[PDB]
Amino acid sequence: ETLTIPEGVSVDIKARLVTVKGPRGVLKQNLRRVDIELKKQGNTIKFIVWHGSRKHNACIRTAYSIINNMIIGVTQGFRYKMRLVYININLTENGTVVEIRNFLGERITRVIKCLPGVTVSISSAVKDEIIIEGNSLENVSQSAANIKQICNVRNKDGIYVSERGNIE
RNA sequence: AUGCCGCGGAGCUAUCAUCUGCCGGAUAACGGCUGAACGCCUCUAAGCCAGAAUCCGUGCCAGAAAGCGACGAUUUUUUGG
Residue A97 burial by CB count (10 A; 0-12/13-18/19+): exposed, middle or buried? Predict the structure, then answer.
């Protein structure tokens, strides 16, 4: 369990931080969640443990898995497919905020502001599918979950969601 | 002991009259995201969102008579300063 580092990646450890750099951009996360020592070998990262408890088995895994996500985020995307199921539905909003209209004919108009590093490009490749992309896996999925949650139906057709993937 | 009756300005007064009465934050229940342990799964393990007439504020009332600031003039040619 010594994950390595690809070409053109600068991993730095500083007060339990991960700040990997990449041509796609910069993406960082606070890792003040693991009480296990971190050692940087230059081309690989190793998580030594010493007589840990049961919770130590989880922590090294959680630190490891989040480590892997930063590495994929160097020069790879995190595209998510959306779905619009229906009264028809429409999306019209600019920038990193998304608005929904005619959701089951409701007069209300909702607003959804995506987290930094998550962008919508109002896809037109196919009917009823808007790609959402970015590097931060947490924010990219969090923005997508926010759109689904706010598109709620009360009392009781249901509105589902498509698959995932990578881009770039 | 306001003698009695009509009207009676002013004032007082009427849900018998008229005017005026917000939006911010943190949450509960509960629901999602990144993610494990228990090599899979799963909202939880750290964390991040969303969230009620709830709670805390801004707003409204008082203003500490022993909380405080800015500013003005400083007994007038007697006498005091």
Answer: exposed
